[PDB]
Enzyme design. Sequence first.
Site, PDB file in Angstrom:
ATOM      1  CD  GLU A 160      30.573 -15.062  19.398  1.00 45.95           C
ATOM      2  OE1 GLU A 160      29.614 -15.140  20.191  1.00 45.95           O
ATOM      3  OE2 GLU A 160      30.843 -15.961  18.573  1.00 45.95           O
ATOM      4  CD  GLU A 201      28.222 -24.426  17.110  1.00 42.93           C
ATOM      5  OE1 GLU A 201      27.103 -24.841  17.454  1.00 42.93           O
ATOM      6  OE2 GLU A 201      28.521 -23.218  17.139  1.00 42.93           O
ATOM      7  NE  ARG A 257      21.381 -23.110  19.320  1.00 44.53           N
ATOM      8  CZ  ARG A 257      22.182 -22.121  18.901  1.00 44.53           C
ATOM      9  NH1 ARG A 257      23.090 -21.602  19.724  1.00 44.53           N
ATOM     10  NH2 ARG A 257      22.116 -21.663  17.648  1.00 44.53           N
ATOM     11  CD  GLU A 288      30.438 -20.047  16.450  1.00 46.16           C
ATOM     12  OE1 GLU A 288      29.817 -19.679  15.444  1.00 46.16           O
ATOM     13  OE2 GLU A 288      29.929 -20.757  17.355  1.00 46.16           O
ATOM     14  CG  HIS A 318      30.038 -22.694  20.135  1.00 51.00           C
ATOM     15  ND1 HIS A 318      28.831 -22.114  19.819  1.00 51.00           N
ATOM     16  CD2 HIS A 318      29.981 -22.987  21.461  1.00 51.00           C
ATOM     17  CE1 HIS A 318      28.074 -22.054  20.901  1.00 51.00           C
ATOM     18  NE2 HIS A 318      28.750 -22.577  21.908  1.00 51.00           N
ATOM     19  CD  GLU A 360      27.298 -14.522  23.151  1.00 51.03           C
ATOM     20  OE1 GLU A 360      26.491 -14.736  24.093  1.00 51.03           O
ATOM     21  OE2 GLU A 360      27.323 -15.191  22.086  1.00 51.03           O
ATOM     22  CG  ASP A 369      67.402 -20.274  27.589  1.00 52.47           C
ATOM     23  OD1 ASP A 369      67.872 -21.436  27.556  1.00 52.47           O
ATOM     24  OD2 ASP A 369      66.895 -19.767  28.613  1.00 52.47           O
ATOM     25  CD  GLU A 420      30.266 -16.893  23.447  1.00 47.88           C
ATOM     26  OE1 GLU A 420      29.207 -16.999  22.774  1.00 47.88           O
ATOM     27  OE2 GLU A 420      30.499 -17.518  24.514  1.00 47.88           O
ATOM     28  NE  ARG A 425      26.481 -25.321  20.998  1.00 46.55           N
ATOM     29  CZ  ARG A 425      25.755 -24.305  20.591  1.00 46.55           C
ATOM     30  NH1 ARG A 425      25.792 -23.948  19.317  1.00 46.55           N
ATOM     31  NH2 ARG A 425      24.988 -23.628  21.446  1.00 46.55           N
TER      32      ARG A 425
END
Lengths: 466, 466, 370
Positions: B218, B355, B337, B127, B267, B210, B48, B129, B357
Amino acid sequence: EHVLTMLNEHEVKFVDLRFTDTKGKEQHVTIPAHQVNAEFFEEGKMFDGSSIGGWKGINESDMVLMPDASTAVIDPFFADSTLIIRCDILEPGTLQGYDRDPRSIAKRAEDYLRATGIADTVLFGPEPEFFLFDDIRFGASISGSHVAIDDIEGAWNSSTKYEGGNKGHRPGVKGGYFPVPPVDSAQDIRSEMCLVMEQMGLVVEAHHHEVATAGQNEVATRFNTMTKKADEIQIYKYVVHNVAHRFGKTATFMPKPMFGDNGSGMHCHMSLAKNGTNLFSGDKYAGLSEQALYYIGGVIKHAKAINALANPTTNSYKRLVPGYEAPVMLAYSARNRSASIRIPVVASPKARRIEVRFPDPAANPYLCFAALLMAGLDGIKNKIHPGEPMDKNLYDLPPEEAKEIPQVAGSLEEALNALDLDREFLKAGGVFTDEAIDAYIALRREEDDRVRMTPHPVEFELYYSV
Amino acid sequence: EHVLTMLNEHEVKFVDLRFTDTKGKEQHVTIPAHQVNAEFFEEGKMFDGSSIGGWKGINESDMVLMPDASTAVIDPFFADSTLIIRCDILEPGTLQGYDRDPRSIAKRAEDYLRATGIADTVLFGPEPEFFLFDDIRFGASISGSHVAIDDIEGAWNSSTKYEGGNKGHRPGVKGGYFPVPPVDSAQDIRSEMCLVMEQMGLVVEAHHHEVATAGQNEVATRFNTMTKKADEIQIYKYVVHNVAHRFGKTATFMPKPMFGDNGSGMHCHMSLAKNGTNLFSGDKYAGLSEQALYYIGGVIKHAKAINALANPTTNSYKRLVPGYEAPVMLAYSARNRSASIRIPVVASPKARRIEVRFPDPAANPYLCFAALLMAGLDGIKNKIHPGEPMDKNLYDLPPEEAKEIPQVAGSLEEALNALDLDREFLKAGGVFTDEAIDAYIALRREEDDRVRMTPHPVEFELYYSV
Amino acid sequence: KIEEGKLVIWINGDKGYNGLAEVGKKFEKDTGIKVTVEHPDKLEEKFPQVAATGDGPDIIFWAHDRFGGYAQSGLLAEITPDKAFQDKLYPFTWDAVRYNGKLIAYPIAVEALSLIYNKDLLPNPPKTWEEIPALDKELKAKGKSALMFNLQEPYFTWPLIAADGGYAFKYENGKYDIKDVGVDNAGAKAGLTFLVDLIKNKHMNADTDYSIAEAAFNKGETAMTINGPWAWSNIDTSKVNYGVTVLPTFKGQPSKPFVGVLSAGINAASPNKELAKEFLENYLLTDEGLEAVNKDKPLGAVALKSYEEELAKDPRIAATMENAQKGEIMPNIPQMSAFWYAVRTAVINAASGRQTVDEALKDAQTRITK
Ligand SMILES: OC[C@H]1O[C@H](O[C@H]2[C@H](O)[C@@H](O)[C@@H](O)O[C@@H]2CO)[C@H](O)[C@@H](O)[C@@H]1O
């Protein structure tokens, strides 16, 4: 003989004789294995009729328990090896089959099917749903009444303090359809139920969590011939109830235990057959035979009376309420899930059938299935045409022509009354007697009365300050 | 055939069919192993559609579950031997692949990649977490609402009285990055998660505590092709959730469960390839190909729309707030960063990649990854130049030119609206349909509403005495 | 179980069943046990069916890839040659007939496909699959064709599919991983695409089967065909002036035929096992028995060292060995039958244009890791 060998093979110490009462509840009595002899099978054992509700009265108490050797199966829960043997209730001397015995009634209905020559076997595939809770409390006395439900999955427990911490991954309201564990806390238990069901002769097709929060679940089993399936339903319930108990839970097949979330239904897939061919496949709508359509017409014509058996509790009507997915519109369709009769779209014509959606698990297997059949047959015998399929929408908008098309009974009393008046199709072939029907109605009216006469908690909310 | 041998090799009793809904939550249904036959693989099983949120409506309920035999893996938690088989959702008859099935959508996107000939495979290395708690309590009703978090690692428990004494070695606020045990209480559990993840086909690269107090952790896994990685994410979450449950904990992938400490991000490392060569290595900035730069440009151009899939919860925006390390500036750099797009500095050009983020673990694997790809491709097809890399600073001082450079959406609604308007790049190749997109948006708006309409505890602090 | 006090042998129709019958004859003339040789159609399929019921031949001959499945279903008897008898055969050939460490058949010969070319239309064979289209263009102008081979049997097409990387089951740490299949990877896709393009562009037809290909080369209409040792006999008979050589390369890599070890198994259901063993080890598996068979339809490279020694020197045999060396011995796992039927559909559907290559190989992949 197969039975006498099962006794030795499993070193059986007891034989548990089982049967069902008018309400649909499996009953039992036990005898030591050594009490099983040749006589036992030909003449059965005697018991007091007057003890079961709605059966023999003041004068004619004694009746016969006739073991049906085909039903022998080991009980997987009892501590001492014991063999279960389902029995029919026969009138003494005549050894006929009690008018009020639901299994006899269901057998009579399968007979009448073959007799009319319309088909030689009926196929039933019911889908009973159920709930698994941790705590269930209720009561009612002069000073009040109440009901309290509790389960580790209940969404309301998102705030509850637990001894070892609240691990909180719970199915929200109407959010039980398939989150993987840990949200779904019943995988291991659903499988034990499956394994055990199969050890008891059932064939399992699938198992899954259902929609409601707080433990709604479902084990889907393969169809079977009508009477054997009702037997399977009883076993099914037994397994569910007992596996739950062994796991520290408590299961219920009540149709609507909670306001605000899904109720539990028992859809019934049906089809007829003769010499191995499916009498329901054809060139008409969705792959149907014209026979199927007459059957549908029958079900629709006698829906309200069938309700008295397929939705035998006042609670049943708390599930069948003007809702969106409420299977209350007396119509058929292959899509519109507003229609109480769905037509499964399947490839193999060998699997063509109809799905009557309004039944609930509280229904007596036997009587519910039988009433469904008899209504179908009367639909055939009298070529009752279905009319056209509803592919529009449900009960709400529509609301155009006030949308007063066919509908299922809206209360138990109404259903009982329909059964009263519209009883002919059931008496056909002498399957249901007036006495049986009147007795059934009386049992349920007593139940209907408790609910009608006892103040409801909501009435205080609504009228205490009046 | 490999599947049919795994059934015998592991004496499997059940097969757990899995799939993901629009929100990203893995779902399942189970069938006995004996229900697995030749048919099963070619035509799947029926179910269904109307039951899953945002899927088929009132009329077209039934759909197909198509087992993907490549995904077969044993469940390490269930009591009875059971084999998990991921499934795609196909339209009946056509057996096409449901417009709203996130796995089908992700597959379509991998197809379109090969079709444009831009590359033959996409590589994703997310990645995710997560947090591990002991107690999580919450609720909301007319008279209030609340949320209470508790874990043995929580810094707040430095003062708590414990039955056997407070052993007090806890990670302080933002002080979880690597103190050895006993400060880090999750070594044994992180490894079980690793071992189990690998038993399920994932390849683990590392595991560590972490930053946040109270159990942020992580497990880093090796990248894989886009759709297989999203599958891995689902398994990853499953393992995390269930190992935690088995250890007496409760894990959550919510992006910001606590104000004042780290949120959880996901990330996403990405790169493209053709005939074994990395289409992202080159002579341009930090070892990049000009293709990589166009990809980045695409991601930046459609960031706000991607947000609707990569940060699909109102909670997501409590992580993406003007903070120092907040991955909110739509720019790239190999160092800064502050930039939501980092360029890993690595030696082997075979490992060159980008990457992104800002994604969080609440994101639907499938849809998030797909949207990231489509944005990248549209960046290529239209040679969207990135501009120059930001190597200065984040959101605070700067504050020179009011620093209004690109930024990710600041609220879910904003992201949903962006997705609404900026949907073309997703519809490319017929990957995402308007219906799918509109349905997704509707599901999330309902969620956004709950949060917008329910009084917030802080509002009392701020305005009760108004 | 049936059988008797006689021997019934089943061998494929393309092998030298009359040489085999000449060998039964001196078994019988020297023993009183008469041997009956049959070559039913689909025997490899028919065997499991009738043997399952306890009947069928006393002895069955097929390539070794089908034997793992027969053994798992319990249809074959474990054979026991002693180290002396074992010693007479190349050891890689006993390895091919081992299932779960037990020997379940006697290895007879090593089969690999080769390029066969008409020296009169093509004194020098092409070294590459890629120059075939051009070549066809030229011959076609002269009423001929460059190449025709059986497209209906996946066995004939696998060398091209495997050349750039396709593979059946990954061999990983002493065993085959049944979930790691390479029928839909980039090499396999490049290979089938190339084939489909041949057809697309009219160099080849989608319907060519064994007979059409064979008649074509034998009548001088096509300059090359791909076949095994067993086809050489008819060629000789037609007197074409042919050479046998290495298969062409694709993308610079060798074509990689699956190699089959022709094998003889004993029906678990036979009363005659001892007779059967006498026959195989003492009549057929000699220089004399192998040669009666090989004069009927050539066997390829034989597992009997003594005979093999006389066999090649033959340049046809040397080429057989070279393609074999570039190929890979087939797995004998029960899963070989799923692999073959899946790959059979895929090629036909792709060559016929019913499915694209990507769609065909993907379905195949799914079907197998069923
Ligand atoms: O095409 C699949 C088929 O390939 C192989 O069969 C070969 C056989 O090995 C050779 O001896 C010769 O007879 O021709 C066959 C191809 O027609 C496999 O041995 C066989 O199991 C498979 O079905």
